């Protein structure tokens with residue numbers, strides 16, 4: 506599950522969240538979306554069908570889906586998710602890793618050293 | 624810390640640089656740049672005595688520190704021509720933040736000698752002002 | 756950095772020594788303050804004898820310092836050497852916390868006593 510592009514978060518109108526499921530052996534897989542912990546009606550997002558992924562040796566399949574949601578809700582920090590359901594999984598469970606949130610380092614040094622310059 | 628680009632003594636700023644041929648990814652390497660500022664905590668704004676209080680704001684423009692305007696000599700064909708080296712040196716006039724060890728700084732003070740007054744001259748940096 | 760002298764100096768107890776340091780002969784450098792200081796550990800670089808008239812308590816009666824402006828040199832004499840005077844020292848000009856110095860190393864060895872059958 507991928508973070509939005511930066512340039513769509515500069516006009517501050519709408520943002521896009523893309524859920525990619527890749528590399529599974531049977532060609533039948535569901536994708537459901539949910540806001541926080543409540544789901545959405547399926548007329549609010551777009552999901553594709555599955556295709557034969559190009560691969561060396563053995564065959565896989567992939568599927569994609571997206572969602573356009575309001576920019577200020579993502580700027581607030583509401584959580585979105587993705588539920589990929591499958592028959593060859595333990596319980597067909599989810600993944601919810603997107604929110605709105607550089608590396609700084611602050612040090613204090615005594616440095617009564619041997620002999621140095623600045 | 625290998626090659627000196629700027630050694631300025633009106634503002635007391637020094638810039639060096641070095642190509643650090645780093646260990647990992649041995650066909651690419653970084654360019655490091657070191658800058659050193661020494662800030663005096665007891666100097667005035669103009670260098671005279673009663674000017675204004677002690678300076679509390681210090682501004683450094685690296686486009687001015689790296690400037691080069693003294694004419695140079697260039698051998699083009701079989702000739703010596705003189706050229707400039709910068710686009711911006713339309714003019715001292717710069718303000719200095721520190722002193723310099725190799726220059727005098729004096730002042731003038733009027734004192735009384737019974738009758739009239741004089742124009743007594745006073746050394747502000749006593750090491751550099753001997754007549755020699 | 757323009758300052759130069761003898762890098763290593765050896766003697767034995769009871770003997771004297773004479774150290775010479777060199778500087779550029781510009782008129783600031785002739786009238787400024789000259790110093791001999793012992794760069795110990797724990798931060799400081801305490802002065803032992805200076806050009807303005809300072810002589811320390813440990814160097815009383817033993818040392819002096821003479822400035823020759825036309826050579827651009829200045830000499831330090833130290834008499835009645837001991838084994839506690841082994842360490843790292845510095846010539847210099849001006850203020851100690853700047854770097855117009857030069858490092859000197861001095862080692863004093865124990866002399867002969869009660870083995871003189873050769």
Ligand SMILES: *[C@@H]1O[C@H](CO)[C@@H](O[C@@H]2O[C@H](CO)[C@@H](O[C@@H]3O[C@H](CO)[C@@H](O)[C@H](O)[C@@H]3O)[C@H](O)[C@H]2NC(C)=O)[C@H](O)[C@H]1NC(C)=O
Nearest residue numbers: 668669670671672673674715716717718719728729730731
């Ligand atoms: C920083 O301070 C210095 C020192 O005060 C300023 O320079 C001095 O400015 C005064 C007034 O402009 C000059 O006095 C003039 O003297 C002549 C005689 O030589 C007389 O004809 C004028 O009527 C006036 O009395 C003085 O010469 C001048 N220079 C010195 C003392 O070397 C300077 O202007 C100040 N700079 C800034 C940016 O504030």
Ligand SMILES: *[C@@H]1O[C@H](CO)[C@@H](O[C@@H]2O[C@H](CO)[C@@H](O)[C@H](O)[C@H]2NC(C)=O)[C@H](O)[C@H]1NC(C)=O
Nearest residue numbers: 773775776821822823824825826827828829830
């Ligand atoms: C420049 O250094 C020389 C050392 O080579 C000085 O010469 C000695 O000066 C002392 C005076 O303190 C005399 O007692 C010595 O006889 C001189 N010669 C030697 C070989 O030591 C010289 O004095 C210095 N220059 C000036 C102008 O004093």
Ligand SMILES: *[C@@H]1O[C@H](CO)[C@@H](O)[C@H](O)[C@H]1NC(C)=O
Nearest residue numbers: 816817818819820832833834
């Ligand atoms: C003082 O300096 C003179 C140089 O004129 C020197 O001969 C003498 O040995 C010095 N005194 C000492 C080291 O006590």
